Amino acid sequence: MRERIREHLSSEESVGLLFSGCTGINDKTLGARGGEVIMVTSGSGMGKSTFVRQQALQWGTAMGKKVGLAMLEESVEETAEDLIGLHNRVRLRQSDSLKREIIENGKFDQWFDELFGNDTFHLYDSFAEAETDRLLAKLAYMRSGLGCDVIILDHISIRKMIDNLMTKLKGFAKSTGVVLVVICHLKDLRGGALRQLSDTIIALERNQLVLVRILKCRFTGDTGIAGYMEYNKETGWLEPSSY
Amino acid sequence: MRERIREHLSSEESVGLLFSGCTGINDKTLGARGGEVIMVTSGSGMGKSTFVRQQALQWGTAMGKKVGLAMLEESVEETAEDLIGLHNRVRLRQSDSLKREIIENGKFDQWFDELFGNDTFHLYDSFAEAETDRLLAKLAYMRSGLGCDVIILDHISIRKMIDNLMTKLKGFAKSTGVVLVVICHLKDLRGGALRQLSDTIIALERNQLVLVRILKCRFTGDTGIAGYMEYNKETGWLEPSSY
Amino acid sequence: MRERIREHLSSEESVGLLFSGCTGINDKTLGARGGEVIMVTSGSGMGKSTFVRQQALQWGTAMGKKVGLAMLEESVEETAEDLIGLHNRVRLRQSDSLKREIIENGKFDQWFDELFGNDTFHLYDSFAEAETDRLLAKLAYMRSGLGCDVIILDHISIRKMIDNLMTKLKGFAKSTGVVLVVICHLKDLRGGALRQLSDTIIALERNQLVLVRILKCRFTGDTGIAGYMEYNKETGWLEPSSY
Amino acid sequence: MRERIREHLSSEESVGLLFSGCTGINDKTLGARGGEVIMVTSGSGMGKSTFVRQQALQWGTAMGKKVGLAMLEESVEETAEDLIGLHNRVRLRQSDSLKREIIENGKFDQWFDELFGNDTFHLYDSFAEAETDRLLAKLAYMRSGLGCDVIILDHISIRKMIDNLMTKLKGFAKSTGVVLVVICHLKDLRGGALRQLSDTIIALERNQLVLVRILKCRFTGDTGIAGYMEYNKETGWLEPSSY
Amino acid sequence: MRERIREHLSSEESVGLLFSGCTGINDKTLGARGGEVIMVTSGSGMGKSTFVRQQALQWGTAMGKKVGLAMLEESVEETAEDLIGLHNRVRLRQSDSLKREIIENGKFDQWFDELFGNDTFHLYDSFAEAETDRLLAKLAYMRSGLGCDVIILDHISIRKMIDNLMTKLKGFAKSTGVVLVVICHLKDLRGGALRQLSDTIIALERNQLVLVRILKCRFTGDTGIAGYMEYNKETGWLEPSSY
Amino acid sequence: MRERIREHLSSEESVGLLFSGCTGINDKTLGARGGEVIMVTSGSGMGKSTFVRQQALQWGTAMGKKVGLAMLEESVEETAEDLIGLHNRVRLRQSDSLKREIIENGKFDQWFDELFGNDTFHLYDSFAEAETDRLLAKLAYMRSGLGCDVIILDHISIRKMIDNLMTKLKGFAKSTGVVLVVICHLKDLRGGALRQLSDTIIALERNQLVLVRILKCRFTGDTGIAGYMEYNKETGWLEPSSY
Ligand SMILES: Cc1cn([C@H]2C[C@H](O)[C@@H](COP(=O)(O)OP(=O)(O)O)O2)c(=O)[nH]c1=O
Ligand SMILES: Cc1cn([C@H]2C[C@H](O)[C@@H](COP(=O)(O)OP(=O)(O)O)O2)c(=O)[nH]c1=O
Ligand SMILES: Cc1cn([C@H]2C[C@H](O)[C@@H](COP(=O)(O)OP(=O)(O)O)O2)c(=O)[nH]c1=O
Ligand SMILES: Cc1cn([C@H]2C[C@H](O)[C@@H](COP(=O)(O)OP(=O)(O)O)O2)c(=O)[nH]c1=O
Ligand SMILES: Cc1cn([C@H]2C[C@H](O)[C@@H](COP(=O)(O)OP(=O)(O)O)O2)c(=O)[nH]c1=O
Ligand SMILES: Cc1cn([C@H]2C[C@H](O)[C@@H](COP(=O)(O)OP(=O)(O)O)O2)c(=O)[nH]c1=O
């Protein structure tokens, strides 16, 4: 047992992929570990995608990880436009001028390669269909075929479709070891499987500055509010706050 | 994807119909885009109609757009009287003298043609009935038949009648691409569907000078108070303020 | 629509019964129109009755209108005594001498006929009972039977009794077209239905010379203080001031 | 109505019990009428009791009225001593000599009969208990049993004890028709029920010669300062001034 | 009542302990009565202690009364030194020579006995602590145990410490019947409880000869300036003036 | 108490350091005692420094006391030059000749030793900084370290800097027992703490011969003008006058 414990001790990975932007989030969760399903939820328009996108950007950019992004609602172009702006600290969607200036400027193309030029980001859309298996097959391919380290499912709103999907999702993450982040719309109880299968659930709250609350973290058990973030309307990035 | 993003970038219309009178409203909303439902709400008598009417006047007059106006509460004559006065910077309803002077003067007729002479404004009343479909059928006709660019529904007060109507309205706007502005009476929470389906919600506040608050804007997400306006009791126009 | 607007324009009555004594009140309200409910409120003993009474005197006397007065609190004699004094610019209630002198003098009788001799004023009391319908039935009779142009309800203090009554009152005024003035005791918010149903609300303020404030006027929307009046302790008439 | 108004006119009592000592007090109040509650208030030691006492003396002495005096704070002897001195224009409480001289002189007894010998004054003390009903029962007896025309409650300082008492007091005065004068200690707003129920409120002010201010008079409405009085330190009587 | 008034008349003590040195002080106050709290106030160094001390000297010396003196600020020796000098019309504190001469002369001892030899004066110090009850306990002992007729508290400067103390002091004086004189430092309004609880307030004023003003006297009500006194820099006694 | 008073009597020091030059100053103040703060004030250039300097010279020279001098405005050399001249009855600052003659003459050096040769005078400058504590620390050192009997602070002009300083100064003097003389510039009321904390305040007045007025002396209380002095323009010494 002694030797059995030792190697067990020196082989266990407690700290996963560290999050970014919110001072305190890593304290209460120790980052994202493989095989775990992170659930990021809150009200519509409260900044879920942005936050996840930001995490994705840093993971694939700085942590040198491969990130696949599967969008159920919006298209790839839309997603691509968001990441590029984000990466370039500008909000392409808000400036008809910038969009026009950047294309003839040659900056678009320069921006496109400096981001997707490598094999780091894998965006997939067209899952508009409500079939789980068709979805799981694509996810499984993104992991095995594209070697994605992190897969973000965007998005799901609160039957068995969700119950069964959440159980299939958690099964996929646990068995492969990929980090699966899922974005769910909330219109703890505010979400069965949704709460049960998810390993860590993060929720963002706003004015009614965003409050990041850790509703649940199996591994650490440390719950509560991890900290606050401030959205920069000019850059579109969520920044750590001094609240 | 590259070419897919590019054309997506150069084909997206971020700035819609710009609003008028309030310095700052366009900053936080980037105007009104087609397929979106703008909700203008506040207390009764707080200036909702005026504001919308003003927007309508400029849109159909300066922006060269076709504006249909569907009134649930008041008659066409009443509406027509308001626009004409507005257009002529006078308050017909307040001056028994002016009304009388303008008819024998020949200015009424001159005013009537210089405004409705063209096929730009389409006023429809007699929706007094509480049936949605009868209403949707007329709206759909104003868009398709009369080619209206903007449709203002005046008005609605806070069941399914509203819930279902709001969902039918948003469905009509999204699918056709028309800009639908709806005026609702409030006697964010102050309004389900009302808040959910509406893309942008503007609220006016007064003394208890009008404060224009942007309760919600999906596209931009930029919320808060856009600015202030000053009502000119002599002209009836809401003017930009220096508060 | 053109012809439809025209006649609408030449048939609309913007200026109602003009008020008297306060230079500016008509400016911000354009007088009292039929079908509207005017609410005159303020602290007890602040001069509500006097003001209304004065308006009533001029309306029935100079404007050649029929005025019915329904008193909930005081008796007809009391009211009659007030009008007569008012009409004769003397305060009968304050002079035991004058009352005695005028009866044997023959001036009482001369005063009584020169005021009530005609079918212009209709005073009704004995509504001490808290039943609305009994009240509405009498009001409706004063309008239809006695052909009263203006009906003053004196008075009401701030449930449904008031809520339902105010809604019944406004319904009676709108449908018949009579001008209903109601006096309410206040011990804008200082008053639901009270504020909602009333078309114009006038409030008098004093020393803690009377300030006439127009809390609300649907038709005109022009709010604020209309002007000041000075009470003549010798005549009992409120006079226009030079404040 | 005519005959109804007439007799109403010739049966109404406008002028009540006239006050004494202050030229002008009767002008602004027309004296004290039955069924009304007069409130006399001011700072402690400012001369409230004296003033009331003086009124009481004249009422019961010259106006041939019966005056009951109920003291909450001080004893009957004390009150009796004050009235006697007052009646005899001397300050018994200030002269150890006079008190001694008057008893052996036989003047005390002569003074006692010439004042209380008749059934005009009724002094009651021992209400030290804070119970209202016990108090109302005694008051009611002073009116009905002793036939008191005027009842002076001395005194009360500023809950429901006061709120409920004031409402019980006003109810007692209105229903019986007695004139109830109440003395309250003030340490218009300076006093709910206190201001509301009281028909006339008189306040005395001094040096920081006494100024008599009429804070409120329902019947007349005439407010303001009625005049000034000068306290005679030798006689203890408040005299009319020439300020 | 008659017999009740009589004995009341012949048992009442209007004139208390007469003051000394200022012709007129007794006129406006009739001396100090038991159960009353006399407040002597003015600017620091204006002669408060001296005046009180002088009163104390005469009371215990000529009026044959027992006087207890409780000092909060200074020591007994200091007080004793003042009284002795005062009693001997010399200022011990000002003459290093006299102090030295009197001790070897044997006059000190002769002076000490001729003043404190009897059980007339009771000086207590060491109240430096800010606790009221500890103070009240000593005062109560000076009254009951030492049978002091007059107690002088020296001194207090202007919370609840003062508010509560003043209310405890007045309660002690009223219930026991002792005359409590309190010296307060002023750096009528110049002083709540201080003004309220005190029965008589005397103030001294100087050059910016001392003016003695009677700010308040419940019993007599006679206020104003009682007269003037002249300080004898050689004897230390305040003398009556001819101003 | 007897023995307690006696020793108190024979241990008290009434007469402090006697002043010089003005016949009468000691009469009204009995000199300067330890623990007291003497304030010498008047208009700029009216002779404050001279007077104090003179006192300092005599104290340290004839009374055999140690005098520390702390200058806020001028330098040590300047001060030293003044004392030396003063000591030698000549005005060094006025004679370019004398200054030159005395240095080569050897009289400077002889003068310097015959004055500062001993450890009697301690001059400190360089307090130009507006910090109190830095100042108090030096003062405390002059007392404890240098054993100064008298400390002259020169100078201060009329917040908390002065308020707090005066309270710190008085606290330092009372607790140590040193005599602290402070010179303040006046551009009784002419000066809170300044007047309050100071034990004795002396003021000099001139022609618009110097008049010495004792504005205040706690210990003695004797106020008024102590006498007059005549400035000798040739020696620089203020001399007693025969006015
Ligand atoms: C957090 C946040 C978002 N937003 C905007 C950006 C987007 O246009 C819009 C939606 O944000 P999004 O991240 O899509 O929210 P969610 O995923 O919860 O639906 O809101 C702001 O304008 N300000 C903010 O502070
Ligand atoms: C904003 C505003 C409105 N109004 C008047 C104009 C109209 O007669 C009346 C109603 O305005 P309206 O635009 O109808 O208000 P809403 O649509 O919120 O019910 O108020 C003013 O008089 N002053 C003002 O500043
Ligand atoms: C306005 C006013 C009223 N009054 C008097 C007249 C009446 O006797 C009494 C009540 O006035 P009233 O009109 O009855 O007041 P309201 O209707 O608000 O209760 O006040 C004055 O004496 N002076 C004034 O300036
Ligand atoms: C008005 C007045 C009262 N007083 C005295 C008489 C009484 O002893 C004392 C209290 O008067 P009082 O009438 O009791 O005052 P209140 O009822 O307001 O408490 O004051 C004067 O000495 N001078 C005056 O001018
Ligand atoms: C009244 C007076 C006091 N004094 C002195 C005597 C004391 O030493 C000092 C303080 O007097 P004191 O009685 O202590 O004043 P208070 O009690 O108001 O503080 O003042 C005079 O020198 N002259 C005077 O005319
Ligand atoms: C009193 C006095 C001063 N002085 C001069 C001496 C110095 O040069 C100057 C300033 O005196 P100083 O003592 O410094 O005055 P203060 O301290 O009040 O500012 O005035 C005279 O010339 N004649 C005089 O009579």
PDB file of C-alpha atoms in Angstrom, chain D residues 25-162:
ATOM      1  CA  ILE D  25     -57.470  87.650  19.389  1.00  0.00           C
ATOM      2  CA  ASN D  26     -61.257  87.913  18.849  1.00  0.00           C
ATOM      3  CA  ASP D  27     -60.711  89.514  15.471  1.00  0.00           C
ATOM      4  CA  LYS D  28     -58.902  86.436  14.088  1.00  0.00           C
ATOM      5  CA  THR D  29     -61.032  83.804  15.897  1.00  0.00           C
ATOM      6  CA  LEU D  30     -64.346  85.346  16.795  1.00  0.00           C
ATOM      7  CA  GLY D  31     -64.110  83.826  20.324  1.00  0.00           C
ATOM      8  CA  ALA D  32     -64.685  80.216  21.408  1.00  0.00           C
ATOM      9  CA  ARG D  33     -67.751  78.309  20.141  1.00  0.00           C
ATOM     10  CA  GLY D  34     -69.327  75.237  21.736  1.00  0.00           C
ATOM     11  CA  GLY D  35     -68.286  71.847  20.363  1.00  0.00           C
ATOM     12  CA  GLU D  36     -64.847  73.171  19.477  1.00  0.00           C
ATOM     13  CA  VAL D  37     -61.505  72.260  21.035  1.00  0.00           C
ATOM     14  CA  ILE D  38     -59.160  75.188  21.614  1.00  0.00           C
ATOM     15  CA  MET D  39     -55.492  74.284  21.968  1.00  0.00           C
ATOM     16  CA  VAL D  40     -53.218  76.672  23.775  1.00  0.00           C
ATOM     17  CA  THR D  41     -49.554  75.714  23.401  1.00  0.00           C
ATOM     18  CA  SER D  42     -46.029  77.113  23.747  1.00  0.00           C
ATOM     19  CA  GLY D  43     -42.778  76.475  25.681  1.00  0.00           C
ATOM     20  CA  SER D  44     -42.900  75.447  29.365  1.00  0.00           C
ATOM     21  CA  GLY D  45     -43.095  78.499  31.680  1.00  0.00           C
ATOM     22  CA  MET D  46     -44.110  80.715  28.721  1.00  0.00           C
ATOM     23  CA  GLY D  47     -47.468  81.644  30.444  1.00  0.00           C
ATOM     24  CA  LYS D  48     -49.952  79.060  29.166  1.00  0.00           C
ATOM     25  CA  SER D  49     -51.785  78.403  32.440  1.00  0.00           C
ATOM     26  CA  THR D  50     -51.960  82.065  33.343  1.00  0.00           C
ATOM     27  CA  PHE D  51     -53.568  82.967  30.029  1.00  0.00           C
ATOM     28  CA  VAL D  52     -56.090  80.181  30.233  1.00  0.00           C
ATOM     29  CA  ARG D  53     -56.763  80.868  33.879  1.00  0.00           C
ATOM     30  CA  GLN D  54     -57.422  84.475  33.022  1.00  0.00           C
ATOM     31  CA  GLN D  55     -59.897  83.437  30.345  1.00  0.00           C
ATOM     32  CA  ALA D  56     -61.513  81.106  32.800  1.00  0.00           C
ATOM     33  CA  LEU D  57     -61.797  83.849  35.428  1.00  0.00           C
ATOM     34  CA  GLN D  58     -63.540  86.250  33.081  1.00  0.00           C
ATOM     35  CA  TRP D  59     -65.805  83.576  31.564  1.00  0.00           C
ATOM     36  CA  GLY D  60     -67.076  82.312  34.897  1.00  0.00           C
ATOM     37  CA  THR D  61     -67.008  85.751  36.483  1.00  0.00           C
ATOM     38  CA  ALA D  62     -68.243  88.233  33.893  1.00  0.00           C
ATOM     39  CA  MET D  63     -69.785  86.121  31.194  1.00  0.00           C
ATOM     40  CA  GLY D  64     -71.729  84.303  33.908  1.00  0.00           C
ATOM     41  CA  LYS D  65     -70.605  80.886  32.654  1.00  0.00           C
ATOM     42  CA  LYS D  66     -69.779  77.732  34.681  1.00  0.00           C
ATOM     43  CA  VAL D  67     -66.104  76.712  34.331  1.00  0.00           C
ATOM     44  CA  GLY D  68     -64.715  73.338  35.289  1.00  0.00           C
ATOM     45  CA  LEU D  69     -60.958  72.959  35.569  1.00  0.00           C
ATOM     46  CA  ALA D  70     -59.311  69.521  35.435  1.00  0.00           C
ATOM     47  CA  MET D  71     -55.645  69.498  36.455  1.00  0.00           C
ATOM     48  CA  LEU D  72     -53.408  66.531  35.518  1.00  0.00           C
ATOM     49  CA  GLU D  73     -50.148  67.871  36.910  1.00  0.00           C
ATOM     50  CA  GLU D  74     -50.871  70.202  39.888  1.00  0.00           C
ATOM     51  CA  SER D  75     -53.339  70.061  42.836  1.00  0.00           C
ATOM     52  CA  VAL D  76     -56.594  71.929  43.428  1.00  0.00           C
ATOM     53  CA  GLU D  77     -55.200  74.027  46.249  1.00  0.00           C
ATOM     54  CA  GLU D  78     -52.455  75.260  43.954  1.00  0.00           C
ATOM     55  CA  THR D  79     -55.029  76.121  41.278  1.00  0.00           C
ATOM     56  CA  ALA D  80     -57.319  77.710  43.811  1.00  0.00           C
ATOM     57  CA  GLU D  81     -54.474  79.792  45.104  1.00  0.00           C
ATOM     58  CA  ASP D  82     -53.769  81.042  41.605  1.00  0.00           C
ATOM     59  CA  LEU D  83     -57.346  82.011  40.788  1.00  0.00           C
ATOM     60  CA  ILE D  84     -57.832  83.791  44.127  1.00  0.00           C
ATOM     61  CA  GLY D  85     -54.664  85.816  43.661  1.00  0.00           C
ATOM     62  CA  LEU D  86     -55.619  86.519  40.096  1.00  0.00           C
ATOM     63  CA  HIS D  87     -59.076  87.535  41.132  1.00  0.00           C
ATOM     64  CA  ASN D  88     -57.540  89.822  43.743  1.00  0.00           C
ATOM     65  CA  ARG D  89     -54.803  91.069  41.519  1.00  0.00           C
ATOM     66  CA  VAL D  90     -52.032  89.795  43.874  1.00  0.00           C
ATOM     67  CA  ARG D  91     -49.564  86.949  43.636  1.00  0.00           C
ATOM     68  CA  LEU D  92     -50.135  84.843  46.692  1.00  0.00           C
ATOM     69  CA  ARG D  93     -47.395  82.379  45.786  1.00  0.00           C
ATOM     70  CA  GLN D  94     -44.757  85.125  45.780  1.00  0.00           C
ATOM     71  CA  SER D  95     -45.484  86.720  49.129  1.00  0.00           C
ATOM     72  CA  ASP D  96     -45.008  84.715  52.295  1.00  0.00           C
ATOM     73  CA  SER D  97     -46.181  87.872  54.024  1.00  0.00           C
ATOM     74  CA  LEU D  98     -49.439  88.348  52.105  1.00  0.00           C
ATOM     75  CA  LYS D  99     -50.401  84.708  52.594  1.00  0.00           C
ATOM     76  CA  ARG D 100     -49.918  85.080  56.324  1.00  0.00           C
ATOM     77  CA  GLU D 101     -51.514  88.533  56.504  1.00  0.00           C
ATOM     78  CA  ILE D 102     -54.632  87.439  54.491  1.00  0.00           C
ATOM     79  CA  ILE D 103     -55.415  84.415  56.671  1.00  0.00           C
ATOM     80  CA  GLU D 104     -55.466  86.222  60.034  1.00  0.00           C
ATOM     81  CA  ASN D 105     -56.904  89.358  58.295  1.00  0.00           C
ATOM     82  CA  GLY D 106     -60.012  87.367  57.365  1.00  0.00           C
ATOM     83  CA  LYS D 107     -59.526  88.379  53.750  1.00  0.00           C
ATOM     84  CA  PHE D 108     -58.777  84.811  52.697  1.00  0.00           C
ATOM     85  CA  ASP D 109     -62.197  83.574  53.697  1.00  0.00           C
ATOM     86  CA  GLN D 110     -63.828  86.697  52.229  1.00  0.00           C
ATOM     87  CA  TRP D 111     -61.889  86.050  49.045  1.00  0.00           C
ATOM     88  CA  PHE D 112     -62.738  82.348  49.001  1.00  0.00           C
ATOM     89  CA  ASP D 113     -66.524  82.964  49.145  1.00  0.00           C
ATOM     90  CA  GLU D 114     -66.587  85.909  46.791  1.00  0.00           C
ATOM     91  CA  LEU D 115     -65.106  83.466  44.218  1.00  0.00           C
ATOM     92  CA  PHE D 116     -66.126  79.886  44.945  1.00  0.00           C
ATOM     93  CA  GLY D 117     -69.129  80.825  47.109  1.00  0.00           C
ATOM     94  CA  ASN D 118     -71.280  80.437  44.035  1.00  0.00           C
ATOM     95  CA  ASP D 119     -71.518  77.282  41.935  1.00  0.00           C
ATOM     96  CA  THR D 120     -69.533  78.812  39.082  1.00  0.00           C
ATOM     97  CA  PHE D 121     -66.058  77.197  39.275  1.00  0.00           C
ATOM     98  CA  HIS D 122     -65.443  73.420  39.471  1.00  0.00           C
ATOM     99  CA  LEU D 123     -61.821  72.374  40.070  1.00  0.00           C
ATOM    100  CA  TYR D 124     -60.850  68.660  39.783  1.00  0.00           C
ATOM    101  CA  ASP D 125     -57.472  67.117  40.222  1.00  0.00           C
ATOM    102  CA  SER D 126     -56.140  63.649  40.770  1.00  0.00           C
ATOM    103  CA  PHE D 127     -56.027  62.367  37.253  1.00  0.00           C
ATOM    104  CA  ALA D 128     -52.353  61.548  37.779  1.00  0.00           C
ATOM    105  CA  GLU D 129     -53.196  58.157  36.330  1.00  0.00           C
ATOM    106  CA  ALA D 130     -52.538  57.795  32.582  1.00  0.00           C
ATOM    107  CA  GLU D 131     -56.006  56.402  31.756  1.00  0.00           C
ATOM    108  CA  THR D 132     -58.116  58.253  29.225  1.00  0.00           C
ATOM    109  CA  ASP D 133     -61.537  56.760  29.914  1.00  0.00           C
ATOM    110  CA  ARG D 134     -61.226  57.540  33.625  1.00  0.00           C
ATOM    111  CA  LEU D 135     -60.547  61.077  32.481  1.00  0.00           C
ATOM    112  CA  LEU D 136     -63.366  61.211  29.908  1.00  0.00           C
ATOM    113  CA  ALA D 137     -65.803  59.951  32.526  1.00  0.00           C
ATOM    114  CA  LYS D 138     -64.942  62.820  34.828  1.00  0.00           C
ATOM    115  CA  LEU D 139     -65.117  65.351  32.036  1.00  0.00           C
ATOM    116  CA  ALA D 140     -68.478  64.043  30.943  1.00  0.00           C
ATOM    117  CA  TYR D 141     -69.641  64.430  34.510  1.00  0.00           C
ATOM    118  CA  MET D 142     -68.415  67.970  34.770  1.00  0.00           C
ATOM    119  CA  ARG D 143     -70.538  68.786  31.692  1.00  0.00           C
ATOM    120  CA  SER D 144     -73.667  66.829  32.436  1.00  0.00           C
ATOM    121  CA  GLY D 145     -73.620  66.725  36.234  1.00  0.00           C
ATOM    122  CA  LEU D 146     -72.076  70.112  37.066  1.00  0.00           C
ATOM    123  CA  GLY D 147     -73.385  71.793  33.868  1.00  0.00           C
ATOM    124  CA  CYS D 148     -69.945  73.287  33.076  1.00  0.00           C
ATOM    125  CA  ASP D 149     -70.038  75.589  29.996  1.00  0.00           C
ATOM    126  CA  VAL D 150     -66.247  75.473  29.504  1.00  0.00           C
ATOM    127  CA  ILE D 151     -63.771  72.715  30.467  1.00  0.00           C
ATOM    128  CA  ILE D 152     -60.054  73.358  30.661  1.00  0.00           C
ATOM    129  CA  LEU D 153     -57.750  70.332  30.605  1.00  0.00           C
ATOM    130  CA  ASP D 154     -54.390  71.226  32.174  1.00  0.00           C
ATOM    131  CA  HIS D 155     -52.239  69.773  30.927  1.00  0.00           C
ATOM    132  CA  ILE D 156     -50.848  67.467  28.253  1.00  0.00           C
ATOM    133  CA  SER D 157     -47.393  67.095  26.711  1.00  0.00           C
ATOM    134  CA  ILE D 158     -46.558  65.515  23.336  1.00  0.00           C
ATOM    135  CA  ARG D 159     -48.433  57.390  20.269  1.00  0.00           C
ATOM    136  CA  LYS D 160     -52.121  56.676  20.794  1.00  0.00           C
ATOM    137  CA  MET D 161     -52.475  57.976  24.361  1.00  0.00           C
ATOM    138  CA  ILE D 162     -52.390  61.493  22.922  1.00  0.00           C
TER     139      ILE D 162
END
